[PDB]
Amino acid sequence: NYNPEEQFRCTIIRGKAKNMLDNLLPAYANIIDDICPCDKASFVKDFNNRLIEILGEETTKKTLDNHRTEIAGKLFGMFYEDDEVIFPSGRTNKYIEDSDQPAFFKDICFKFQFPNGMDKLDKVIEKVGAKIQIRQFPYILQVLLTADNNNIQLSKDDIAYYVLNSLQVLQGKIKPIEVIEKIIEDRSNDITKKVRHPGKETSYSMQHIREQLNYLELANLIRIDGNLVKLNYREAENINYIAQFWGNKPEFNAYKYDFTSEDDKKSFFKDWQQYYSN
DNA sequence: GTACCCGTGGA
DNA sequence: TCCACGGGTAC
Numbered sequence: 001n002y003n004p005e006e007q008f009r010c011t012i013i014r015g016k017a018k019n020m021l022d023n024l025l026p027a028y029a030n031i032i033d034d035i036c037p038c039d040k041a042s043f044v045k046d047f048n049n050r051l052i053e054i055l056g057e058e059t060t061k062k063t064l065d066n067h068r069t070e071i072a073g074k075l076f077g078m079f080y081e082d083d084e085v086i087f088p089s090g091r092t093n094k095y096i097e098d099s100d101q102p103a104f105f106k107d108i109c110f111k112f113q114f115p116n117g118m119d120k121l122d123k124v125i126e127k128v129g130a131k132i133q134i135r136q137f138p139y140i141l142q143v144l145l146t147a148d149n150n151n152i153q154l155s156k157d158d159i160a161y162y163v164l165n166s167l168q169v170l171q172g173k174i175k176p177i178e179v180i181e182k183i184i185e186d187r188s189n190d191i192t193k194k195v196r197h198p199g200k201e202t203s204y205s206m207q208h209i210r211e212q213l214n215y216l217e218l219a220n221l222i223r224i225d226g227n228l229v230k231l232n233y234r235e236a237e238n239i240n241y242i243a244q245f246w247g248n249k250p251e252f253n254a255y256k257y258d259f260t261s262e263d264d265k266k267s268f269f270k271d272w273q274q275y276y277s278n
Numbered sequence: 279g280t281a282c283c284c285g286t287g288g289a
Numbered sequence: 290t291c292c293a294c295g296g297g298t299a300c
Contacts, residue, residue: 011283011284013282013283014282014283014284014292014293015292015293016292016293016294017293018291018292018293019291019292019293059294060294060295062294062295062296063293063294063295065280065281066281066282066293066294066295069280069281069282070281070282070283073281074281074282118282119282119283120281120282120283120298120299120300121299121300122282122283122298122299122300123282123283200285201285201286201290202290202291203284203285203286203290203291203292204284204285206290206291207284207290207291207292210290210291210292211291211292214291265300
């Protein structure tokens with residue numbers, strides 16, 4: 001009954017800090033911790049002017065704004081806003097104190113879900129319209145554990161097509177054992193699947209899938225060896241704990257908000273930030 | 279008519 | 290075949 005042919009492009013925010021993460025992530029945190037608490041007006045100027053010193057003088061304001069709202073704001077959840085006052089988030093405060101970067105992204109993986117409050121309301125509607133609800137990273141880990149238990153190795157393409165771009169999987173309809181069995185079957189029929197969209201480049205189809213795996217790698221839970229995806233068994237204790245929630249519905253219920261309203265539409269993005277950043 | 283979305287291109 | 294600037298787009 002599990003049919004991977006039903007595909008759905010479910011994206012996360014495009015990354016901007018993978019290359020120089022060891023500088024940018026401390027930069028993000030230290031900038032936020034220093035200038036906050038403060039109103040939104042002061043935050044915009046103070047953040048960008050301090051950040052421009054790291055990214056460069058030739059950096060456009062739009063790029064600086066994008067770093068602030070997409071990465072430090074939404075994807076990493078390093079701050080939040082309450083009554084026009086921007087505070088450093090709980091994840092930032094912990095990172096400031098222990099400097100634990102794997103635990104920073106381990107927390108990101110444990111709480112990341114579909115749908116979420118990172119997307120525009122436009123894309124959120126399509127997420128909720130397709131009855132999408134999943135904790136993908138617990139699911140990814142459980143799939144990897146099941147793969148090893150069946151003596152097979154998964155690639156990035158296997159993860160892409162059969163999990164992170166599979167509609168039924170993203171709806172929480174499919175058990176990981178069903179996915180693995182389907183993969184073993186396709187291989188016996190000499191079938192290799194890939195995520196590709198006609199008239200689009202690899203970035204459109206794969207960048208958000210690769211980068212999702214990147215953060216799982218930064219959490220030190222897996223390793224990307226060429227084209228293969230392997231668990232870090234030195235962190236097996238954390239792998240098994242997180243993997244438990246593969247069949248658990250998202251802890252943040254995005255199916256209780258009316259997006260025809262503006263009361264819920266405003267609280268939706270506020271409540272997500274509270275859940276994700278704290 | 280901002281703010282994530284994503285085309286584009288260096289690497 | 291990553292990865293991120295900054296224009297593209299719909300709140």
